[PDB]
Structure 1
């Protein structure tokens, strides 16, 4: 056949990811014809907001692969499909963006921060209960627009997003993982395809970044047991510290009153199980009730 079709969302960032992948494929395979098949998603207008339609495209042979930001990828996959490649992770941190202010601790009480992330919301409320967390929706550019239009005093966004769009000057301060634990796989893009499609699987191999896969498998094992998605206040971030996966996670109330934290450290080979163990520790420590709450 020699043709690989790529299903992707049609926002500026989504298209950046499609081209990123397309280039790495052409690099390793000079004579491969890569076709982009952009499409809209429910979230742009199961929990398949930004993914369902790409999965339908994969199941109908309308595309061969689907490109997503790892944090948008669902934990459940329909019969036949699955995540097969995890690319090199970019900066996984959240970032404080603002025009008139230089930092979070410099915002006066009452300042309006924008984010619809319950994960980001719970952590800020825990430290700065005097701040107003206002919901924000839309592509990066629309979010930046609203901030410039004075609708919010500041907004929180992923560092990986702004950097890739050449808007890294908007990053007023990259928040440390300790102060804002990243969402699962933030900073990494994942490729989904038909498990039986060996042809596509082999062509995709060269794009897999082993270390990043290790980190994200652990983070996702944690989330999968917790059966969460973007709509739940869950933090999950792993690092490769001296040949060992150091996994951290949290589940907190939107108001920031109760936040359940936990950590685990072990050999790379036990990434999935350590994530599963950590998740259960959180469940028994009250996460179950907090999650049932939301």
Structure 2
């Protein structure tokens, strides 16, 4: 019959479309009268959305801006995927087993600084590309390993054949939002917001909100050696781990805070780390990037 057709904007990568289709398939489980169509197309997707050219988009949370444009919102955060960083070694060695001088591919200062904090006798080498391109570069270029998000590999069904070691937060604190998706829509799209409600995972959303408040107060992002991971403890409180590192791994600011209110705990984590010197570090790193 004649039902509202929800237009879902997506990037064209294998991963982007996979995450988008995942979300659509989950929403279909409610069996409500909506049709979904993907429009293959964060700031451009946002402009299209404000213009009503699309109704929603699915992004990786770790790629979301600190402030959404007025009139848009994160209308849903589904159950988190794996939050962890993953090591993918060409010849199968765990992190501690890689040979002295092993070249590990990442363009993330957060990742590389944490690895250099554990081992001096490795090299961190820039790499770019979508996940599949990076895995090919590992094979065909001078890298001994790469770091990827476990979540991306999982979404694609590639983990089994790729991951050498899942990195616990104790040794690589994840990027804020890693493994979470942001489903963005118009703030006034009440019908779509109600559809999205059943997919929202409150324990994930509250943990990520804490992470995000911390990142925004620190003026962090993907280009900065900053990390934050929140989870819900068995008693119900949120625990937030916050980290800033020097690019060379020699200086590490790392704290844990526990509380009920994600805004209060994110803000406190930020204040704590800023008093210790982590904000000055961030500002200096930004001065020495292009």
Q: CA deviation at 1:178?
A: 0.5
1:178-257 matched pairs, under 5 angstroms:
178-242=170-234, 243-257=236-250
Q: CA deviation at 1:29?
A: 3.2
1:132-143 matched pairs, under 5 angstroms:
132-143=123-134
Residue aligned with 1:28, SS: coil
Q: Deviations over 1:117-138 (max 9, x none)?
A: 1110110111112211001110
2-structure distance, mates of 1:190, 1:140: 19
1:66-81 matched pairs, under 5 angstroms:
66-81=57-72
Residue aligned with 1:265, SS: strand
Aligned to 1:260: 253
- Of 147, 160, 163 in structure 2, the residue corresponding to residue 156 of structure 1 is 147
Q: How many residues align?
A: 281
Q: CA deviation at 1:187?
A: 1.0
Q: CA deviation at 1:150?
A: 3.4
1:90-129 matched pairs, under 5 angstroms:
90-129=81-120
Aligned to 1:45: none
1:57-68 matched pairs, under 5 angstroms:
57-68=48-59
Q: CA deviation at 1:30?
A: 4.2
2-structure distance, mates of 1:165, 1:53: 25
Q: Deviations over 1:11-69 (max 9, x none)?
A: 00111111111111111134311010112xxxxxxxxxxx1111111111110011101
Q: CA deviation at 1:166?
A: 1.0
Aligned to 2:168: 176
Q: Deviations over 1:76-98 (max 9, x none)?
A: 11111121210000111111101
Is 1:290 the counterpart of 2:273? The answer is no
Aligned to 1:147: 138
2-structure distance, mates of 1:208, 1:287: 33
Runs of 4+ in 1 over 6 A off after TM superposition: none
Is 1:7 the counterpart of 2:9? The answer is yes
Residue aligned with 1:170, SS: coil
2-structure distance, mates of 1:99, 1:69: 26
Aligned to 1:37: 39
Q: 1:24 to 1:259 in 2, by over 3 A?
A: same
Q: CA deviation at 1:239?
A: 1.4
**Unmatched tracts of structure 1, length 5 or more:** 40-50
Residue aligned with 2:244, SS: strand
2-structure distance, mates of 1:101, 1:191: 36
Q: CA deviation at 1:272?
A: 1.2
TM-score (norm 2): 0.94
1-structure distance, mates of 2:75, 2:226: 24
Aligned to 2:30: 28
2-structure distance, mates of 1:122, 1:272: 27
Q: CA deviation at 1:196?
A: 1.5
1-structure distance, mates of 2:204, 2:158: 24
TM-score (norm 1): 0.93
